Amino acid sequence: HGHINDIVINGVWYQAYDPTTFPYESNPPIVVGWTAADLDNGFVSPDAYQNPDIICHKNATNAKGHASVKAGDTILFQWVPVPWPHPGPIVDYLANCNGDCETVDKTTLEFFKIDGVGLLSGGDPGTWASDVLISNNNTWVVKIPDNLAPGNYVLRHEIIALHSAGQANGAQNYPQCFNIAVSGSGSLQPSGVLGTDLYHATDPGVLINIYTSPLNYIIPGPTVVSGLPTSVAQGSSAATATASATVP
Numbered sequence: 433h434g435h436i437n438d439i440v441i442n443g444v445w446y447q448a449y450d451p452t453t454f455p456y457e458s459n460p461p462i463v464v465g466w467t468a469a470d471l472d473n474g475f476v477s478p479d480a481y482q483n484p485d486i487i488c489h490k491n492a493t494n495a496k497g498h499a500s501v502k503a504g505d506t507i508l509f510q511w512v513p514v515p516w517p518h519p520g521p522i523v524d525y526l527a528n529c530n531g532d533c534e535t536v537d538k539t540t541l542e543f544f545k546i547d548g549v550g551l552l553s554g555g556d557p558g559t560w561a562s563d564v565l566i567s568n569n570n571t572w573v574v575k576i577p578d579n580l581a582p583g584n585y586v587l588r589h590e591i592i593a594l595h596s597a598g599q600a601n602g603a604q605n606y607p608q609c610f611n612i613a614v615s616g617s618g619s620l621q622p623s624g625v626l627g628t629d630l631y632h633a634t635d636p637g638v639l640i641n642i643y644t645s646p647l648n649y650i651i652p653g654p655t656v657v658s659g660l661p662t663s664v665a666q667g668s669s670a671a672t673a674t675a676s677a678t679v680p
């Protein structure tokens with residue numbers, strides 16, 4: 433259980449949606465993260481994998497601003513509270529908004545996977561991507577590909593928690609969506625998958641007992657785009673400056 437407090441984009445700190453705070457305000461601010469109803473720091477379950485809640489989390493509605501980024505930039509996600517409590521994989525996706533992300537229909541988004549890290553070693557439980565996040569003060573770093581075509585995209589970052597995933601409907605997904613506007617010179621526009629088609633409750637990386645050894649793990653969802661590393665070098669770094677979500 434947790435949520436993202438902020439993202440840091442080449443040293444530039446942006447406030448994220450805070451579902452434990454903003455819904456208690458009369459006039460919450462416009463931020464880069466989607467509005468969502470995880471006030472309990474909770475999860476989407478496999479029984480909602482074919483429901484809109486899996487796309488950007490519970491009842492999510494569009495962020496009303498966006499963070500402008502350069503293709504090749506890295507983005508750091510900051511989870512709270514410290515420490516993230518569960519074993520599981522970590523994955524990131526982009527979807528072209530074919531227009532402003534502030535107004536895109538989330539059910540139309542076609543997501544392509546730009547990273548994914550799963551079981552790094554061992555078993556029962558073994559070492560996972562989430563352990564790397566925990567070690568890096570609850571952060572994860574994703575690189576925006578150098579050659580991504582300029583455009584507006586939703587960045588969908590997600591932790592999957594597998595501690596209870598031996599039972600049907602046991603896996604816990606924690607998607608968090610952000611609006612970015614990408615500038616660059618490249619033309620890469622990869623083929624994507626609808627949010628409600630990414631995952632199925634019987635997938636071998638969703639219905640799985642991690643408390644066994646030896647253990648192998650197939651990360652759920654589509655392949656990482658050819659040519660991209662499945663992760664860039666992880667490691668936390670401080671912000672040097674602060675920005676606000678840019679409104680259209």
Ligand SMILES: *[C@@H]1O[C@H](CO)[C@@H](O)[C@H](O)[C@H]1NC(C)=O
Nearest residue numbers: 468469470471472490491492
């Ligand atoms: C999400 O929306 C539905 C429909 O309005 C509502 O009944 C539900 O309580 C909302 N979920 C949360 C956790 O607020």
Ligand SMILES: *[C@@H]1O[C@H](CO)[C@@H](O)[C@H](O)[C@H]1NC(C)=O
Nearest residue numbers: 437510511512513514569570
């Ligand atoms: C670790 O992350 C939390 C959440 O951003 C923050 O309160 C804390 O100061 C961070 N630790 C350091 C050493 O910055």
Ligand SMILES: *[C@H]1O[C@H](CO)[C@@H](O)[C@H](O)[C@@H]1O
Nearest residue numbers: 440441442443506508669
């Ligand atoms: C510190 O370094 C990290 C690692 O790439 C960035 O994501 C962050 O925005 C800051 O530059």
Ligand SMILES: *[C@H]1O[C@H](CO)[C@@H](O)[C@H](O)[C@@H]1O
Nearest residue numbers: 622623624625626654655
């Ligand atoms: C491109 O590839 C993806 C699979 O990653 C499909 O979902 C899409 O329809 C197209 O074939």
Ligand SMILES: *[C@H]1O[C@H](CO)[C@@H](O)[C@H](O)[C@@H]1O
Nearest residue numbers: 482483484539626628629
């Ligand atoms: C995933 O499921 C949703 C329904 O919630 C559809 O809109 C979508 O096209 C896909 O089948």
Ligand SMILES: *[C@H]1O[C@H](CO)[C@@H](O)[C@H](O)[C@@H]1O
Nearest residue numbers: 631632633634635636639
């Ligand atoms: C797990 O297996 C079921 C078959 O009963 C599939 O429908 C699902 O897509 C997943 O592969």
Ligand SMILES: *[C@H]1O[C@H](CO)[C@@H](O)[C@H](O)[C@@H]1O
Nearest residue numbers: 641643644645646647648
């Ligand atoms: C639990 O399951 C793993 C496979 O997931 C086996 O390799 C192990 O021997 C144990 O039966």
Ligand SMILES: *[C@H]1O[C@H](CO)[C@@H](O)[C@H](O)[C@@H]1O
Nearest residue numbers: 554555556644645646647
């Ligand atoms: C889990 O435990 C088994 C026990 O044989 C190991 O072989 C495996 O490599 C993992 O550590």
Ligand SMILES: *[C@H]1O[C@H](CO)[C@@H](O)[C@H](O)[C@@H]1O
Nearest residue numbers: 622623654655656657658
């Ligand atoms: C992941 O990679 C495979 C093979 O390169 C593609 O078929 C898929 O669409 C995705 O880009």
Ligand SMILES: *[C@H]1O[C@H](CO)[C@@H](O)[C@H](O)[C@@H]1O
Nearest residue numbers: 655656657658659660661
């Ligand atoms: C996947 O596809 C891209 C383009 O062909 C290659 O760059 C990569 O090495 C892998 O074949």
Ligand SMILES: *[C@H]1O[C@H](CO)[C@@H](O)[C@H](O)[C@@H]1O
Nearest residue numbers: 548549550552661662663
């Ligand atoms: C992403 O996944 C690839 C292939 O599974 C690993 O080789 C890489 O180190 C990273 O974990």
Ligand SMILES: *[C@H]1O[C@H](CO)[C@@H](O)[C@H](O)[C@@H]1O
Nearest residue numbers: 549564662663664665666
């Ligand atoms: C991306 O990050 C993972 C997790 O640290 C590494 O295992 C991988 O080699 C790459 O650095």
Ligand SMILES: *[C@H]1O[C@H](CO)[C@@H](O)[C@H](O)[C@@H]1O
Nearest residue numbers: 568569571668669670671
């Ligand atoms: C990752 O951790 C470092 C401390 O190692 C912080 O400076 C950074 O803000 C992030 O929390």
Ligand SMILES: *[C@H]1O[C@H](CO)[C@@H](O)[C@H](O)[C@@H]1O
Nearest residue numbers: 441442443444671672673
């Ligand atoms: C904080 O400060 C550093 C150095 O001036 C920048 O690289 C970063 O983008 C932010 O302005």
Ligand SMILES: *[C@H]1O[C@H](CO)[C@@H](O)[C@H](O)[C@@H]1O
Nearest residue numbers: 445670671672673674675
């Ligand atoms: C701009 O301001 C934010 C919060 O006001 C800090 O988190 C950041 O380090 C930067 O100084």
Ligand SMILES: *[C@H]1O[C@H](CO)[C@@H](O)[C@H](O)[C@@H]1O
Nearest residue numbers: 447461462463675676677
């Ligand atoms: C940019 O605008 C945002 C949204 O009002 C503020 O929260 C931020 O401090 C800066 O004024």
